Design a protein around this nucleic acid. Sequence first.
RNA 1: GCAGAUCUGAGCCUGGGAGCUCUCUGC
Length: 91
Amino acid sequence: ETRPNHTIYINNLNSKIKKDELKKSLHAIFSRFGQILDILVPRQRTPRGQAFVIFKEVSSATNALRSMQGFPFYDKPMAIQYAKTDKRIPA
RNA sequence: GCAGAUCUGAGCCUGGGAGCUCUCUGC
């Protein structure tokens, strides 16, 4: 169960890409949709090609999810969903 | 505790990967 929120969850990412470059590249491509609060690439026991992009506005997440769904990124089609739980930290 | 680290540290769980623990580093 997911519903629109600030955070998109991306997998099927190319796991050979260095994490720093991956973050820069995700930021460059997804910043077009709106301001990004953070990009998380969680460390796991093995590389699994997963990341979260946290937008400042939900509409940005909505349009990013629609527009980039299945779009090639480093030669792999992105699989995007809304995050099950918003990663936004509104403190 | 917080933040980081493995196709370039490790053991598990899973067996169609949005899982757990450890170790190391800084604070």
